[PDB]
Structure formats: structure tokens, C-alpha cells
Amino acid sequence: IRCIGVSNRDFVEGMSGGTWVDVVLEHGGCVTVMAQDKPTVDIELVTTTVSNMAEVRSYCYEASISDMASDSRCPTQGEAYLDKQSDTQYVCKRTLVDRGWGNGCGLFGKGSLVTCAKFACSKKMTGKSIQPENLEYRIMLSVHGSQHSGMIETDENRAKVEITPNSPRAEATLGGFGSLGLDCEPRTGLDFSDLYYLTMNNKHWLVHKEWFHDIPLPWHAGADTGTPHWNNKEALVEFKDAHAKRQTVVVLGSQEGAVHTALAGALEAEMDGAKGRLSSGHLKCRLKMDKLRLKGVSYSLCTAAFTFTKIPAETLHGTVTVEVQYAGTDGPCKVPAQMAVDMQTLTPVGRLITANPVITESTENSKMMLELDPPFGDSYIVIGVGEKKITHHWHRS
């Protein structure tokens, strides 16, 4: 069904009091929950989202310069002046340079030189804050066992639920099975509110705050962003050795690759509609199952012949999947399905993960998939009852 193919799959069995089951979810996997006299339920954390992320600071990693100008004074002739000195968008540099008869001065002393160049940001990165109240977790719950395969359905057998730090509880409504209660809480170890959400050229990371604050790049505070004011423009703007009347101004190359190098190992994230999308958390949920019911408890056993349509396969966790075909028309009915070691008494052994298997189709030759938890050492998969039962040898869990 859902959980069978996933590698990071956990199994939780409920206890005799059929009320509470504790579970922990993560983005890589899913959990299969089995309770006595209850339908088996697969629970998966689907997405983790952050909303309303506020700009903290923006760093410019590629910039350019324009309108380069210089002013010079002969010695004893005062301070060099440019109108661009007071402009906040201009990087400027003032020095003293050797002057003389070669460069047009009466004396040979030091003359003042100033050089300014306009700063423009071509490409920048943006960091955003994460507030605890703005996290949301989406969880999918499914009933283990259905007539047709495939993971694309939304009906009485499946439910999608949404939880929030300020709304930690929710109810997933199945069909005749009833309802399931969810009380969820983040697991300790990864607090997203202690990280910054970093975006650079349609790529997204989760970074530490003190590393983000110490980045040696031009930056602005992420407020009043109509036209920005850039602090530390000198991190990308350099002035070469000065000669009389002029200084050369150069821009450093794009620093996107350097930031990429420094970002190795950082948690990666995504954007979905101005919502941050994370894949690294853990979520502890308590299941309230007192309202969960099986459906076909009082069905009569299927009496026609079952046939294996597929060779049974062993999953990564030692369970067995079996696809069968029922030629019967008398339905709905309960399919006899078990693991047996003593072939005469047919005493059930192992575990039946797909709880209360049933054929819901009234037509002939309906196909259905089963999951079983076999015991260690040789056993037999037994499907059906009577002289029409089918048997298949199996080895271990």
C-alpha cells in the first residue's frame, strides 16, 4: 500500500487498552500502526512549512560600479572634493599622492586625491527569520488494505490533517472505520526558530544566525527596500595603487560560488508559494483510537478459490506481500489469510499486518494485496479455507 516500499518504516503495535498509541514521524519515512480489533493505519508526515518569513538582512554577492570620478589638489591647495562624497550610493577613497612639476604642481609635496564610484547590486542573497508560531505540519493517514493498488486516492480510506504549534490537535475522519485523533508536538533536537532561512538565486538553505551575521559582504537591513543603502561596499569594491589625479576602482568577482562552498552540509529547503518547505524535522504524535472500528468483522468467509497472481516478495523489514485473485462472486467476504507451521491444525503463527482482509467487489476475479509478518524459520502462507486453500512455502522474517 503506502508504507511497504519505504525504507525508513516503523511498526507500532497498540496495547490491550485500545485508546492511545504513540508515534514519531519524519519526512523520509512512515509508520504502520496495528491495534487489536482495529484497522491497521499508515501515518506519514507529508510536508513541513513555514509561513510569513520576515527579511532580516540581505547580502550582495555580485555588484558593479559606474560613474567613476576623481578630484585632485596640488600641495598647499586644500582638500580634494567631489559631489559624490556625501552620496550614500558611492564608495569613495581619499589618499595623499606625490605631486610635482610632472603632474602640474608648483611644489613637490603631497597632494590630496579622492575617488568615488557608484555602487549597484546586481545579485544578492536574503535571509529570513523563522517564528515558532508559523510552522505547520501536514500528515496523511491511510487504512492498510484496499482492492486496488496505487497511492493516488482521497476517500473514506484516507485522510489529510494539518497541525500547528498553537493548534496541535486534529481529527482525521475515515469512513465506516470511524475517526482518529492526533495530538502532535515537535521532537527536540532541531529548533527551526533558531535558524535563518537563506535564499540565494532560487536556492534555499537553513543556516545558523551567527554565521549569517558574520558574512563579509555588503549588506542592508531588509527594511524600506524601495532603494536600498548598502553597508560595507568595500567588501566588493577595491582601489588600486594611487597615482597623481586618479585612482583605479575595481569590483571583485561574483561570490556566489564562495557562499556555495561555505554552505556545504547545510540543511536544504524549498519554496512553495512564499511558504518555506523543510524536510529535516521530527514530529511526535499521540493517536486516540477509541473511535476507530473494523468493518467486515461479521462477514462470512470467502469460500471460492484464491489464486496467486504474483510470487510473494520479501520487503526490507522481513514482511511478505502477497497478491491474490478471487474467482468468487459471493461478496463481500473475509479472505482467510495466515501463516501456519502445523499444517493439520493450521494454528496461526506470526502476524497479519493487513487487518481483517476483505473482498469488496461482487464481480468475479477480483485482485487484492496482503501484507504478513512471518515468524523466523520455515512457515507457510495459507490463503483461503477448506480444500480450495492455497499454500506457499516461506523462510524467515
Three-state SS string over the chain comes to CCHHHCCCEEEEECCCCCCEEEEEEECCCEEEEECCCCCCEEEEEEEEEECCCEEEEEEEEEEEEEEEEEEECCCCCCCCCCHHHCCCCEEEEEEEEECCCCCCCCCCCEEEEEEEEEEEEEEEEEEEECCHHHEEEEEEEEECCCCCCCCCCCCCCEEEEEEECCECEEEEECCCCEEEEEEEEECCCCCHHHEEEEECCCCEEEEEHHHHHCCCCCEECCCCCCCCCCECHHHCEEECCCECCECCEEECCCCHHHHHHHCCCCEEEEEECCEEEECCCEEEEEEECCCECCCCCCCCECCCCEEECCCCEECCCCCEEEEEEECCCCCCEECCEEEECCCCCCCEECECCCCCCEECCCCCCEEEEEEEECCCCCEEEEECCHHHCEEEEECCC
Pairing between strand 267-272 and 275-278? antiparallel
Integer Rg of the chain from CA: 35
Dihedral over alpha carbons 376, 380, 381, 382 (to 10 degrees): -140
Type of residue at 120: A
Cell 589625479 appears where?
A: 245
Maximum distance among all alpha carbons in the chain? 121
Residue 331 CA from chain centroid, whole number: 43
Instruction: Determine the Cα–Cα distance for residues 57 and 232; give it in Å rounded to an integer.
Output: 13
Burial of residue 3 (CB within 10 Å: 0-12, 13-18, 19+) is buried
Cβ within 8 Å of residue 358, ≥6 positions away: 145, 295, 296, 299, 332, 333, 334, 335
Q: Closest by alpha carbon to 33, among 327, 262, 353?
A: 353
Cell of 112: 590630496
The string over 278-305, giving b where at least 16 C-beta atoms fall within 10 Å of a residue's C-beta and e elsewhere, is beebebebbbbbeebebbbeeeeebebb
Contact 285, 183 (CB under 8 A): yes
306-394, what's its fold? Immunoglobulin-like (2.60.40)
Q: How far is CA 333 from CA 300, 358, 360, in A?
A: 5, 6, 7
Q: Closest by alpha carbon to 171, among 282, 292, 281?
A: 292
Cell of 81: 572634493
Instruction: Determine the Cα–Cα distance for residues 392 and 397; give it in Å rounded to an integer.
Output: 15
Instruction: Determine the Cα–Cα distance for residues 369 and 137; give it in Å rounded to an integer.
Output: 30
Pairing between strand 204-208 and 219-220? unpaired
Q: What is the resolution of this structure in A?
A: 2.6
How many residues in total does the chain contain?
397
The experimental technique behind this entry is: X-ray
Cell 577595491 appears where?
A: 238
